[PDB]
Design a protein around this ligand. Structure first.
Ligand SMILES: CCCCCCCC/C=C\CCCCCCCC(=O)O[C@H](COC(=O)CCCCCCCCCCCCCCC)COP(=O)(O)OC[C@@H](O)CO
Ligand SMILES: CC(C)CCC[C@@H](C)[C@H]1CC[C@H]2[C@@H]3CC=C4C[C@@H](O)CC[C@]4(C)[C@H]3CC[C@]12C
Ligand SMILES: CCCCCCCCCCCCCCCC(=O)O
Ligand SMILES: CCCCCCCCCC
Ligand SMILES: [Cl-]
Lengths: 193, 51, 33
């Protein structure tokens, strides 16, 4: 019985780490790729935008997507809500990367202790991602986003635009972070036996 | 509960840890290279490929 | 261009559901005594 116990624990820990790396990739992708919201057929003017970066069409029956925005320079971010959301998503990415670094502690530190460490860090990353996703719609009142989507757009109001893959992928990342955190807690309590 | 463990018994590992400080250099020989290598991978992929 | 993002939202959901299903399978493995 004990050998099966240890084998299942080891394998499930390996899968947990694999999915942790996958969630870190997801967090990096959503943080970088600017496809959180996008135009629609009824939108006055095309483009897309993410946490900080935004590309907007010139509006002459072509693309000419002029692009502007960078987390390094906070001046060009449209709104304070966007700045807060970008900072929270960055903090979540740093936290999950810290857990992937803390995987190195398995040589020396006790397995339960490091499992609880990454459990808490993944939970904190999930909380940060939740706050980022809840705060990001608050900045839709910005003049750039309103000029893009239209006058009907507003605070926590999608309007004419449509959410693109990055937003739903961030929500999926939130769910993944919660389940991975609980998984890490259960594994840490399970190694103790 | 899930494991019959109270909040403290299930979440915080405040039962051992500090005591393990003599092995601080032991962690750093693998913690620091991992963090730098991980930082480079996100840095270079972000600027070269993702954007 | 077809300015429709239904397809991309669709694929994003399939991958997300796959990942979540694998995680719930990990829970099925551990919680099973
Ligand atoms: C592209 C991004 C790449 C990012 C790079 C990620 C890599 C990050 C750096 C280092 C990883 C370090 C992993 C070392 C894991 C070593 C784990 C290990 O030592 O074996 C046992 C099982 O552990 C465990 O079940 C814990 C499981 C550890 C799982 C983590 C390592 C798997 C990495 C698989 C690679 C997948 C990549 C795929 C990405 C697409 C525990 O030992 P032990 O009883 O003696 O101790 C008891 C104690 O009292 C004294 O040590
Ligand atoms: C210490 C280890 C564990 C974590 C390191 C976190 C690293 C990868 C983080 C910290 C700050 C981050 C940067 C912060 C700001 C920007 C500007 C943005 O326009 C592109 C991404 C970029 C360039 C980030 C890339 C990733 C980054 C370098
Ligand atoms: C850089 C190295 C940082 C080390 C951080 C502490 C790791 C945990 C140490 C063991 C604690 C314990 O369970 O006694
Ligand atoms: C395919 C795009 C990958 C983006 C970088 C992933 C880094 C994951 C954490 C090391
Ligand atoms: Cl940038």
């Amino acid at each position: 019985y004990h050998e099966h116990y240890m084998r299942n624990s080891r394998a499930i820990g390996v899968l947990w780490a694999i999915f942790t790396i996958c969630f870190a990739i997801i967090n990096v992708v959503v943080f970088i790729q600017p496809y959180w919201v996008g135009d629609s057929v009824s939108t006055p003017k095309p483009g897309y935008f993410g946490l900080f970066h935004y590309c907007v069409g010139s509006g002459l029956a072509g693309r000419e997507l002029t692009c502007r925005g960078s987390f390094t320079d906070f001046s060009t971010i449209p709104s304070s809500a966007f700045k807060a959301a970008a900072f929270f998503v960055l903090l979540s990415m740093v936290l999950i990367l810290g857990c992937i670094t803390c995987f190195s502690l398995f040589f020396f530190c006790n397995t339960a202790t490091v499992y609880k460490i990454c459990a808490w860090m993944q939970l904190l990353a999930a909380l940060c991602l939740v706050l980022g996703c809840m705060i990001f719609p608050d900045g839709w009142d910005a003049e750039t986003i309103r000029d893009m989507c239209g006058a009907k757009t507003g605070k926590y109001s999608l309007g004419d635009c449509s959410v693109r893959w990055a937003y739903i992928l961030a929500i999926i990342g939130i769910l993944n972070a919660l389940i991975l955190s609980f998984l890490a807690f259960v594994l840490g309590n399970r190694q103790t036996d | 509960c899930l494991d019959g463990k109270d909040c403290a018994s299930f979440f915080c590992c405040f039962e051992d840890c500090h005591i393990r400080i003599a092995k601080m250099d032991s962690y750093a020989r693998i913690f620091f290279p991992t963090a730098f290598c991980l930082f480079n991978l996100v840095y270079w992929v972000s600027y070269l490929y993702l954007g | 261009d077809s300015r429709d993002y239904s397809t991309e939202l669709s694929v994003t959901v399939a991958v997300g559901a796959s990942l979540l299903f694998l995680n719930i399978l990990a829970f099925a493995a551990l919680y099973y005594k």
